[PDB]
Amino acid sequence: MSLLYVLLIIPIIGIFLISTIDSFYFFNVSYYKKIALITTILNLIVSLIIYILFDFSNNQFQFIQENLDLSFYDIYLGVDGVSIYFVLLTTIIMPIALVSNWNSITNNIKSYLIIMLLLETLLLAVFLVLDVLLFYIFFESILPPLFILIGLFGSSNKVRASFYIFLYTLLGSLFLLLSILTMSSIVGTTYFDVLLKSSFEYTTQLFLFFGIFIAFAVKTPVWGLNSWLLRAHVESPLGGSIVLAAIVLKLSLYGVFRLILPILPQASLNLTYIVYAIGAITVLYASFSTLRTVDVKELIAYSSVAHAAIYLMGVFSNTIQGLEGAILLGLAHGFVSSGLFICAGGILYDRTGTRLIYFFRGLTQIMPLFSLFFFILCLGNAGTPLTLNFVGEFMSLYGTLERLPIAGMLASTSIIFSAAYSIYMYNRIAFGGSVSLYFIDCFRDLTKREFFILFTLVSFTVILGIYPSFVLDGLHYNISSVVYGIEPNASYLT
Amino acid sequence: PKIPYPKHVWSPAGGWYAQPANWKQNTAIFGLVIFGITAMVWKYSAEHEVRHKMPEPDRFYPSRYWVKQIKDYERAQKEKQ
Amino acid sequence: SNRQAALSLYRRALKLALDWTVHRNLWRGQALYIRSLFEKNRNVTDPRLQRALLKETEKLLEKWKHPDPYCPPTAPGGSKYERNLPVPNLEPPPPLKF
Amino acid sequence: NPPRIKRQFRDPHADWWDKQERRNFGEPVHEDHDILGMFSPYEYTWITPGKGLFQIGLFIASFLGLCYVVKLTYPDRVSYPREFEGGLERELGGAGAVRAFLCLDD
Amino acid sequence: GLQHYKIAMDPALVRLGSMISNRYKYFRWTKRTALVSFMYVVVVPSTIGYLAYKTDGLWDLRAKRRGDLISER
Amino acid sequence: KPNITGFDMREFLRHTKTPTYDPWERHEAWRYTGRFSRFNRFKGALPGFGIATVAFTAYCVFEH
Amino acid sequence: QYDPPTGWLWGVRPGEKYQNEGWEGPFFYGFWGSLIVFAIAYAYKPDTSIQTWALEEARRRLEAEGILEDPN
Amino acid sequence: RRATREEMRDAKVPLAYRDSCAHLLIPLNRCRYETYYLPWKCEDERHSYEKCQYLEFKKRVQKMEELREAKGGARSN
Amino acid sequence: LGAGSVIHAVADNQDFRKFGGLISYLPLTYSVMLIASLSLVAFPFMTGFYSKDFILESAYGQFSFSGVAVYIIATIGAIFTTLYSVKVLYLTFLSNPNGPRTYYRLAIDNFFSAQAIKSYKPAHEGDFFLTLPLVILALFSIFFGFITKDIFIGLGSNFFVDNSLFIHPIHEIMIDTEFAVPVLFKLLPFIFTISFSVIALTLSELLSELVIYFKFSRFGYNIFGFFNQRFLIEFFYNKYITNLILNLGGQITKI
Amino acid sequence: VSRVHRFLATGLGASMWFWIFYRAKKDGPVLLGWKHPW
Amino acid sequence: EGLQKVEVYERIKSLLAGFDKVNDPNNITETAHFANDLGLDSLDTVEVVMAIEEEFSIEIPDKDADQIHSVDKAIEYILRQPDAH
Amino acid sequence: MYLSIIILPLLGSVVSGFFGRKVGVSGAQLITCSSVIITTILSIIAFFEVGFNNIPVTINIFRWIDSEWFIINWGFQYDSLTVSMLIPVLIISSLVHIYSISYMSSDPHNQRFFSYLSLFTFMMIILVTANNYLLMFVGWEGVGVCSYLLVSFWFTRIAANQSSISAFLT
Ligand SMILES: *P(=O)(O)OCC(C)(C)[C@H](O)C(=O)NCCC(=O)NCCSC(=O)CCCCCCCCCCCCC
Ligand SMILES: CCCCCCCCCCCCO[C@@H]1O[C@H](CO)[C@@H](O[C@H]2O[C@H](CO)[C@@H](O)[C@H](O)[C@H]2O)[C@H](O)[C@H]1O
Ligand SMILES: CCCCCCCCCCCCO[C@@H]1O[C@H](CO)[C@@H](O[C@H]2O[C@H](CO)[C@@H](O)[C@H](O)[C@H]2O)[C@H](O)[C@H]1O
């Protein structure tokens, strides 16, 4: 069997073991948690084995298994240098997601672990499948377990929040389905190798673009459309919020390198000015309203909207630099947003039971270790050099500017306004007076669990910010096949 | 007068007024680990610094005593007639 | 009323003068003039004019307000105010697992 | 909703339950509480904004006035631009570069 | 879930947050709200889009030297 | 017309001088006397000037 | 005069010790240990970057010209 | 004598000073190099460099005045 | 560092209005701070004279309108510089004592009976770690200009010949600034500094009534508060720029 | 007051006013324009 | 450590010693009273406390200005404030 | 030597900041001060070495950003302008540390203060010794972070918080 199926089967084996141990024993919930965490370690172990054996400049799909037994819907699993790092991020994030929420679930612990083990399978799949109809199948199988992850383990406004993400993500995904169905009917299949050969007529590509973009604007999400995220990324449990922002948000970032860039190039080129206008607006309106947010977890959720706009504008630049910067900023947001939900929804909400920023002040005086990590995370969210977030923004903004110079200049306002929301939140909670008077008793500082998941996540952000070539070497050759263009003395050689 | 502070708070930089008794021993140990890291960085520079101009044989230039590119030049220049 | 309120305006009128004249000797002579003005109206009783003296003098303190009145370094609004504020709660936290 | 008055204008010497922010415990709060607090943009009460535009206008006019008198009476140059032999065209980037003065007009 | 530490929950601030979370239930279409809802959603993005349309491929700085022109069109 | 308050700027400015009689005269006497007299006030405004000036004149006569 | 150093690291009061919750076991040996073993192996992984390949050829093209010196 | 353009570049004289009277900048800078730019050790190389540069300035001042009177003392800068 | 010492010596107070005397109490600070003010104003043959006044004469050296304008403009900047540097040295050291009495009470005169052991605090000078910088920094502030004035200024100096500071031969002004400028403009900042310094001392000490007529004139009440308020720039930015952004964010959030 | 502190302050005063006249005596004529520096 | 009682009393005693409006400096006691024991005018006492404010480098809030009518009360104010110099 | 000038201020900061518990207030002060002192002599030497001999020094350590046409090195170049900048930077840093041994003597938090001082010195070195504009920007941002951390050192003063936000966002 292929080694890419081993990534899928392990979480499946782990769900089986959680449901069949109580039959060998009133077993403790501690042993439920250990099995799920070990089984996400193994996926990470395997995924690094896949990465050692990867070939950084091969234009054929790798780790493929020859099926030669065709059906109507067959799983085809290939790994490519444009998808490898999305897989690695998934497998590094899911253990922290489990450890972060280790004592906070308290009830329905089996069901909680079985959903996350299910989620890791489906999100691993969406990066590994070699069809665009297969891509859609897994891109939307994550929807039922997320409706239940929010309504069982979510906060007060959990019911409306779970309806919002499900219904918005269902609606937006059904316009992508109509366009995928058109592509398949014209071409006969949705297997990548046969689609990338095929070139659609301009008018068809103009109508496939309207349909793949409706979906991804719903799933970025852009400003006019993000009302599900400000509910779902907040009412959800801590572990739900980590997966939703780090991994689920990137399903459409990686889905533009497959669905738009190679098969609808003329449409992408001629409509970019519409994308850039939308992207510029969500860099401003989201930045303006991230200043006035009184919910700490909601402030982090709103930050993701402004970040996602920068990478969306990068993936539409037709430049090798904005394309790699978009993947780097997708990865960068993955580690940093994870840490700030760990700070907001998993530490202050553990100790105070509230998310209102009015009750917090001067937390440096009694939690110095929280303050140190909270400040480093806050500076990466502000796009400060030495973090992977700065590199992703620099390259994303450069390509946005080289393609359409006016929108990149309005996108670069982020540099100013991301810094203004990030420092203002940090100053209000850690600094900004003395330990607040609403704290009747003292609050303990970080536990050894809270320290080491923040430390792990922060370490990824810095070392990748110093040596981004750890991720750039795989991207260069594979990214070099989604650029559309020619130069006069370099093309059509004889 | 020293500020009152809570004694349960742990801070990597000491917190309030924090000086251990064994601080001279801790300080000394940190001095060597610094001095060892700096020594590795110095041997790196000596072997990787790049100059396109070479120092005169007579003027003060203590880099001539540790940098390979220069030292190899003057060793070669110390071969004539 | 009209008794504690008046003495406020007096102490204020002394400081505004101090702020605009740095040299203490000159302000001292400048100060005693203010005392005379408060001494010329010692025996006004009717509330119809009692507030009018307060209401009109309340105008000159803004009509001559210093751009930056001096503040003692450790008062509200000083330069060392809230510098090393202690924690308002030094008891160990109650044992709760997280 | 209370009046939108910043707590910078409250008394720094009352019996505030929270002396730093000048707040009492159960007091009603304006919905703009975020940006009415002591850690919020400052209100400057030296002069009305209308008068300030006048005064900064007066400074600008005087600055222009000082500039104007200099233009009327400022010296002519006393040194001829220094002649370079060949224009140093080979020492500045060839003909595709800006070269120094060489037997030209003044 | 876990029991949190004791917080002097402010009756005033709790209802302020409860005001914000429930705010949208009371939004109405007035002449004022349409004006803001029209400027932010239509005018400003339409204005940005128009500049994005008219300057597309207008300028390139790549390799351009003196004697050549930044304008590509 | 004078205000209902008797204050006026012209009289305010004219009184801006050292008062002849002061109820606080003794309390404030220290700031202007002794160590704080004008001679001691500027006795050391130029610290090394005296030492240098005589020293420099020694240098000047040394050449001749 | 300086005070003694203090603090409950991990909230552990000076009497007792940190009780292991469960995560510590796999997170320290499996999670981190996998990254050290990954880092140790990553050193010996061959370089299949497009640049290491494009540099070797592009050097040889420049070497034909006077732009780069040829050892031979 | 006059120092040629080729000779001037080999001693790395600064660009704007490669003028007619820089044959004395070569020994001035060389004197400056050997003395660590101390302002009391090359007193006569400096003076010679300044004195020579002085002459070609007053020469420019003279014939500029001729240019000024050719235009009736109008603004020329 | 010098003004750091005076703030520490009293109460961590920072206001000029409450500092006076303190020249006897802080002998080293006043000299070193006057070492600095003499170079800050570019008194002849200080470290500032070889740098600050060369820009003024090289401004006039570039015989253009803009050069002459900035000479005139920066010259006014020089004269108001000398003015507030008198304000610092006079108020803090050479003025009548303005602060509380504890700043000043020595132990020579006996003001105490049963507490003579403590409760003096007569604004003492700092310790070794406080003074050794000030004295070293002052030794720089004197000799450093003259010692490196050839490395940087020279006349044809070749320190920056690696193109670190490339000047285009179509712009150079050193020869003109060396020869073209007349002696009046070459020397003018010295006259203004030596003129307004004695004037400022006279107004601050000899004739201590003119300034209050100015402050309590209405014309001067406004000119004073225009500058103390920093050209009202903060007021306008905070109200028109900063608070506009907060209300834009509120409008987007609420409406 | 302290003797060491007073000595340092007076000596730093002697640093001026001896550098001043020495530079004024030696380079003063050139600055005023009385004599060219040659 | 901080301010004592003997120190605060003997400064404030020397403060009133230089003030002319007092009837006689002999009767300056800890339980002295500005209103009747020393015989100061109502307008006089606020100018008095303004001297106390400057001597100890603090700020007397207007609410507590009405609470200072005697030396004892004045001393009790300084000692309760850890702020004074 | 040249790459040791860059590294010493960085190393002392790490000890003072994340290891202030272990060395104490005096231990931090000595290491922070002495490490910056050592860097200052190394740079006095580098001034005679680079400027007075017209010998620019290059070092390149590894890639930072390696995309096609965009290769920014973690690299340093010592030239005439570089060594001029270091001398005021390193002396004024060296003396201000010594000054601060007594200025902040009563402050509760000295290990944090002296750490920020060492950190600030590292970032100016990075700013004036980079090969490219983008590594220049690391120090440019680095000194910006160090300024915010020091205008807000007494983070319990709301005035200090306002001025640090103003330093940061301007
Ligand atoms: P004691 O009980 O014996 O009496 C105390 C007083 C008389 C104050 C009583 O409290 C009382 O009965 N009050 C009556 C108040 C009254 O009607 N008149 C008193 C004076 S009010 C007033 O405004 C007087 C004029 C003041 C003018 C100077 C202040 C403002 C000057 C301009 C600004 C500063 C200079 C630029
Ligand atoms: C397409 C469908 C939607 C996709 C998402 C699927 C989500 C599946 C959730 C996991 C399956 C159900 O999970 C199930 O939860 C119930 C809750 O009563 C648990 O049942 C147990 O709960 C608690 C656990 O302490 C016991 O005290 C109780 O006696 C027992 O009923 C089961 O042990 C668990 O297996
Ligand atoms: C960081 C992103 C940078 C790229 C985006 C911005 C690029 C801006 C480039 C502007 C210059 C482009 O090329 C420029 O075209 C403008 C068009 O008005 C010309 O500008 C000129 O036009 C007319 C003639 O038509 C002149 O009389 C007038 O003085 C001047 O405005 C310049 O002679 C030409 O050089």
Ligand 2 centre from A90 Cα, in Å? 25
State how far the Cα of A302 lies from the Cα of A228, in Å rounded to an integer. 11
- Token reading at B34: 């610094």
C-beta of residue L114 within 8 angstroms of C-beta of residue L100: yes
C-beta of residue B34 within 8 angstroms of C-beta of residue L12: yes
C-beta of residue K20 within 8 angstroms of C-beta of residue F25: yes
What are the helix (H) ranges across A352-447? 368-381, 388-403, 405-411, 413-429
Q: What is the domain count for chain C?
A: 1
Cα K21 to Cα A482, F24, K17, K18, K56: the distances in Å are 94, 9, 10, 9, 22
Q: Look up residue A126 and give its amino acid.
A: V
C-beta of residue A246 within 8 angstroms of C-beta of residue A95: no
C-beta of residue L65 within 8 angstroms of C-beta of residue A468: yes
Strands L57-67 and L70-78: antiparallel
Cα A373 to Cα A364, A370, I151, L151: the distances in Å are 11, 6, 47, 20
**Which phi-psi region, left, alpha or beta, contains residue A177 (left: φ > 0; alpha: ψ -120 to 50)?**
alpha
- Token reading at I108: 């020579």
State how far the Cα of A445 lies from the Cα of G11, in Å rounded to an integer. 7
State how far the Cα of I248 lies from the Cα of A292, in Å rounded to an integer. 10
Distance, first Cα to last Cα, chain H: 33
Residue I163, judged by CB atoms within 10 A of its CB (0-12, 13-18, 19+), counts as exposed
Strand partners, K70: K33
State the nearest Cα–Cα gap between C67 and chain D, in angstroms: 6
Say whether residue J36 is in contact with chain H using an 8 A CB cutoff: yes
- Token reading at B27: 């300080």
In 3D, which of L45, I151, I152 has the Cα closest to residue H37? I151
Instruction: Identify from I45, I46, I124, I150 which residue to disrupt to test chain J contact, counting J C-beta atoms within 10 A and taking the largest count.
Output: I45
C-beta of residue L165 within 8 angstroms of C-beta of residue L157: no
C-beta of residue A249 within 8 angstroms of C-beta of residue A341: no
Residue having the nearest C-alpha atom to atom 33 of ligand 2: A110
Crossing angle of helices A320-343/A238-246, nearest 10°?
Answer: 170
Per DSSP, I103 falls in state G
What are the helix (H) ranges across H1-77? 5-10, 25-35, 43-70
State how far the Cα of I246 lies from the Cα of H26, in Å rounded to an integer. 63
Which are the contacts of I240, defined by CB distance < 8 A and separation ≥ 6?
none
Number of Cβ within 10 Å of residue A3's Cβ equals 16
Instruction: Identify from L102, L117, L162 which residue to disrupt to test chain I contact, counting I C-beta atoms within 10 A and taking the largest count.
Output: L102
* H/E segment holding residue L62: strand L57-67
K4 and I115: CB-CB below 8 Å? yes
State how far the Cα of A361 lies from the Cα of I10, in Å rounded to an integer. 32
Contacts of E37 in chain I (CB under 8 A): 255
State the structure-solving technique: cryo-EM
Contacts of A434 in chain D (CB under 8 A): 20
Ligand 2 centre from A111 Cα, in Å? 5
**Helix or strand or coil: residue K70?**
strand
Which are the contacts of D72, defined by CB distance < 8 A and separation ≥ 6?
none
Render G24-72 in DSSP notation, one character per residue.
HHHIIIIIHHHHHHHHHHHHHS----HHHHHHHHHHHHHHHSTTS----
Residue I167, judged by CB atoms within 10 A of its CB (0-12, 13-18, 19+), counts as middle
Which atom of ligand 2 lies nearest, measured to the CA of A29? Answer: 25
Q: What angle do CA L142, L148, L154 make, to 5 degrees?
A: 140
The verdict on whether K62 is a catalytic residue reads no
Which residue among the candidates K24, K37, K41, K66 is catalytic per the annotation?
K41
Per DSSP, A473 falls in state H
Q: What angle do CA L52, L54, L55 make, to 5 degrees?
A: 115
Q: What angle do CA L9, L15, L21 make, to 5 degrees?
A: 150
- Token reading at J36: 């060219």
In 3D, which of F24, I180, A367 has the Cα closest to residue L155? A367
- Token reading at A113: 């672990």
In 3D, which of H37, B61, I165, H14 has the Cα closest to residue L81? I165
In 3D, which of A428, A435, I8, C87 has the Cα closest to residue L108? C87
* H/E segment holding residue L59: strand L57-67
State the nearest Cα–Cα gap between L41 and chain H, in angstroms: 19
Q: How far is CA I45 from the centre of its chain?
A: 18
C-beta of residue I150 within 8 angstroms of C-beta of residue I157: yes
C-beta of residue C84 within 8 angstroms of C-beta of residue B1: no
- Per the structure, the complete domain to which residue C61 belongs is given by 1-98
Render C75-88 in DSSP notation, one character per residue.
STTSSSTTSSPPPS
Neighbours of chain E (3+ CB pairs under 8 A): A, C, D, I
For residue F6, give the chain C residue with the closest CA: C37
C-beta of residue L28 within 8 angstroms of C-beta of residue L114: yes
Contacts of C76 in chain K (CB under 8 A): 59
State how far the Cα of A12 lies from the Cα of A21, in Å rounded to an integer. 15
Q: How far is CA K23 from the centre of its chain?
A: 16
Residues F10-25: b if buried by 16+ CB within 10 A, e if exposed: eebeebbeebeebbbe
D29 and E12: CB-CB below 8 Å? yes
In 3D, which of L28, L29, L22, L19 has the Cα closest to residue L102? L29
Ligand 3 centre from G19 Cα, in Å? 71
